[PDB]
Amino acid sequence: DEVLRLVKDWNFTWSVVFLLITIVLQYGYPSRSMFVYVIKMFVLWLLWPASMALSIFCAVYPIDLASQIISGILAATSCAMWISYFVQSIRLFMRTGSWWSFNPESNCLLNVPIGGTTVVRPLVEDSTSVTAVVTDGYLKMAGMHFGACDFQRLPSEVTVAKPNVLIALKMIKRQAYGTNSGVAIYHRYKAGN
């Protein structure tokens, strides 16, 4: 009697969990929706200690020696991955201060100072040169819209931050098409610590 009840309860909970995992795996990206992205992050933060605790339980209650050894290796694997994520995220945050540094999808950040503020955007591909184009007073860098900026007030330097190194790129080429339209190219010259 009670045998079937536990089947029902466990299967219901697993069905909800499976659906949630499908959703975050299919839609949990900033290029789709920020909402499922935050849900996916919450799942990942919870997922690290649960995996470690599960493997520790199997190490205490193993099927045989092979299960015990595999459980130990998987537990250390869970721990190492969490430590690695935290280290790389903190380093990028100390370098940039942006929350984008906590996104495992992107490990390269582009910082552009517009006037008195700084705008940060994750970079798809690392490069030694960055192209900027402003049209009618609106600035777009590296094929990404960065906002409203006058062509005369373009920054002289722009930075690219990685977990280990920060690189600075200064303006080289400047061409003015119109009153508030033009193109500029920034190239790297110095490496950071």
């Binding site: 942006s98 503020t117 700084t118 705008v119 940060v120 955007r121």
Partner: peptide, 5 residues
């Protein structure tokens, strides 16, 4: 002082 978009 920093806007992440």
């Amino acid at each position: 002082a920093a806007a992440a978009a």
